A paper describes a structure:
Biochemical and structural studies of a naturally occurring G40S mutant receptor, which is resistant to mAb7 inhibition, point to a role for the αA helix in mediating conformational changes in the ECD that can influence receptor activity. To define at the atomic level the effect of G40S on the conformation of the αA helix and the ECD, we solved the crystal structure of the G40S ECD and compared it to the structure of the WT ECD we described previously. As with WT ECD, the G40S mutant could only be crystallized as a complex with the monoclonal antibody mAb1. Crystals of the G40S ECD·mAb1 complex diffracted x-rays to 2.88 Å and are isomorphous with WT ECD/mAb1 crystals obtained in the same condition. The wild-type and G40S structures are extremely similar, with a Cα root mean square deviation over 126 residues of 0.3 Å, indicating that there are no major structural differences as a result of the G40S mutation. Comparison of the structures revealed a small shift in register along the length of the αA helix and also differences in the orientations of some side chain residues in this region, for example residues Asp-30-Glu-34. The change in register of the αA helix observed in the G40S ECD structure, although minor, probably explains the loss of binding of mAb7 to G40S ECD and the subsequent rescue of mAb7 binding by introduction of an N97G mutation in the mAb7 CDR H3. We suspect that the change in register generates a clash between Asn-97 of mAb7 CDR H3 and the αA helix residues Asp-30, Phe-33, and/or Glu-34. The substitution of the Asn-97 side chain for the smaller glycine side chain likely removes this clash thereby enabling mAb7 with a N97G mutation to bind and inhibit the G40S receptor. Specifically, on cells expressing equivalent levels of receptor, glucagon binds to G40S [name] with equal affinity to WT [name] but is less potent in G40S receptor activation.
Numbering used by the authors:
A (entry chain C): 29 to 123
B (entry chain B): 215 to 445
C (entry chain A): 1 to 214
The structure:
């Protein structure tokens, strides 16, 4: 139970840090972020970003070769959901 | 006792700004999403704004975008609503509500459970009207049928601001047949209501009928006698 | 933008009736919906959550149902304190949307209104304005039609109405309608008439006073 949370918090801490050491963007982007699921870099607007499924997932050894996707709008804004929350395509990563 | 308490309401002129507050208690304010809902005087409910923890997830109803700002001070468990460039449609009672969400780690989905706790509400009246006492006019019985049947009389509470006005009859002694009507907003921006009562036509000439009008905002307290006419 | 079509706007019931209020969402909203009761002068209070769940401490006569696009609020046997307004709320997508609402009114027999007309008060005329009030007393149902005529000239745009909440004792409605105009218009015209159209009636009633404050 908790152990999952602990691995998850580990993942977050690690991308909050991983992302400090980054150069400023040279173009219109979507600010880097931890959307509570995966760690995203600065992504150019109107493009879709990819990531290997996050490792805190219990089945990460079976989806290690899979990807999670997040769309960055032409706006320079990541696409949000129905209620405005962090949004993404993790179908590949689901059980 | 989980509670929400709103303050900051009042009269404000169109164009000008107001700040609303919603104090919370009985719970941990930070772990919840907060909403504002308003209701124009004789109308239904309308959702206005919503924030979260971050607060990077703020939404507003179209009609207030770029005009209202929602904020929260977690140090003091308080929700705010900055209202700028106010206008007539903003005139309403404003409630604040609480909503719980839940983040699933495994699935990465966010679940919302709707608005479960509200506040008493607080009134916002947008107007250029100044505090004013009501002019009290009698409405007299007539027929004139001999020795009569049943009759009606009352008081016209006209041209006051702002709401409310309380009306009694014979200092509260008379409560039978009395209909105090809801006030109307006249084209002038001033309010005007009618209070009426039906009485046995025979009791006239003997019983004395006096309406007791009280308009707190202007500290106006009036007693007007209502008598039959001649012609 | 998700629309919440609520039905009906107002209904009629006798204590003990089964009441059914429908809510149709324009977009699939799964079960993210709640029903609300709002007593006069008070804040909404959620009764049903998640479409069909009942809030803790709410009478067992309240039940919600449906999912997706169709939802229903039911009161198995209406109670005297239940005759108030009800709202459905969708929390599936921003912005959040409410239904128009349902005002549940208690039913009684038809009652023609007793009508009275009051000419302007001398003291007001001294001010320069004249208010002619017309009172429709203790009638039912609420639907009523008031028309002003001065010199048999149908008036329009110069009056306002106001209706009291349904009476606790007889369950009737009463309305006041104020036709307002200047001392001048008031002092060049002759006869002022208030014509009332209602159901408990047959022929439209007219109560007329004339200039001379008669």
């Amino acid at each position: 139970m908790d152990f999952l949370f602990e691995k998850w918090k580990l993942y977050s801490d690690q991308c909050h840090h991983n992302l400090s050491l980054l150069p400023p963007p040279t173009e219109l982007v979507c600010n880097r972020t931890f959307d509570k699921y995966s760690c995203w870099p600065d992504t150019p607007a109107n493009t879709t970003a990819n990531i290997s499924c996050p490792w805190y997932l219990p089945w990460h050894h079976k989806v290690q070769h899979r990807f999670v996707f997040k769309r960055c709008g032409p706006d320079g804004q990541w696409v949000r959901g129905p209620r405005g929350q962090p949004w993404r395509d993790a179908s590949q990563c689901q059980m | 006792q989980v509670q929400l308490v709103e303050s900051g309401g009042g009269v404000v002129q169109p164009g000008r700004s107001l700040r609303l507050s919603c104090a919370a208690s009985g719970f941990t304010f930070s772990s919840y999403g907060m909403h504002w809902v308003r209701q124009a005087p004789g109308k239904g409910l309308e959702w206005v704004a919503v924030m979260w923890y971050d607060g990077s997830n703020k939404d507003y109803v179209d009609s207030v975008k770029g005009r209202f700002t929602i904020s929260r001070d977690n140090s003091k468990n308080t929700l705010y609503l900055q209202m700028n460039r106010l206008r007539a449609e903003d005139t309403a009672v404003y409630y604040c509500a609480r909503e719980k969400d839940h983040y699933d780690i495994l699935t990465g989905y966010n679940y919302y459970y709707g608005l479960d706790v509200w506040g008493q509400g607080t009134t916002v009246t947008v107007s250029s009207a100044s505090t004013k006492g009501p002019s009290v006019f009698p409405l007299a019985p007539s027929s004139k049928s001999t020795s009569g049947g049943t009759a009606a009389l009352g008081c016209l509470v006209k041209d006051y601001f702002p709401e409310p006005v309380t009306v009694s009859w014979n200092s509260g002694a008379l409560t039978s047949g009395v209909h105090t009507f809801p006030a109307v907003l006249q084209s002038s921006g001033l309010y005007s209501l009618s209070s009426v009562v039906t009485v046995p036509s025979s009791s006239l000439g003997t019983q004395t009928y006096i309406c007791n009008v009280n308009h707190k905002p202007s500290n106006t307290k009036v007693d007007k006698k209502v008598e039959p006419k001649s012609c | 933008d998700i629309q919440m079509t609520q039905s009906p706007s107002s209904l009629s019931a006798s204590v003990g009736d089964r009441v059914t209020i429908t809510c149709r969402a324009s977009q699939g909203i799964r079960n993210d919906l709640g029903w609300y009761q709002q007593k006069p002068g008070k804040a909404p209070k959620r009764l049903i959550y998640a479409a069909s769940s009942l809030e803790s401490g709410v009478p067992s006569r309240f039940s919600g149902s449906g999912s997706g696009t169709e939802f229903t609020l039911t009161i198995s046997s209406v109670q005297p304190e239940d005759f108030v307004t009800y709202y459905c709320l969708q929390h599936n997508s921003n912005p959040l949307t409410f239904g128009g609402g349902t005002k549940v009114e208690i039913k009684r027999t038809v009652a023609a209104p007793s009508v009275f007309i009051f000419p302007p008060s001398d003291e007001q005329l001294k001010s320069g304005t004249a208010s002619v009030v017309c009172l429709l007393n203790n009638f039912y149902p609420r639907e009523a039609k008031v028309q002003w005529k001065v010199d048999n000239a149908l008036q329009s745009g110069n009056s306002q109405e106001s209706v009291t909440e349904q009476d606790s004792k007889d369950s009737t409605y009463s309305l006041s309608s104020t036709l307002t105009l200047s001392k001048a218009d008031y002092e060049k015209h002759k006869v002022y008439a208030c014509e009332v159209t209602h159901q408990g009636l047959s022929s439209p009633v007219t109560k007329s006073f004339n200039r001379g404050e008669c």
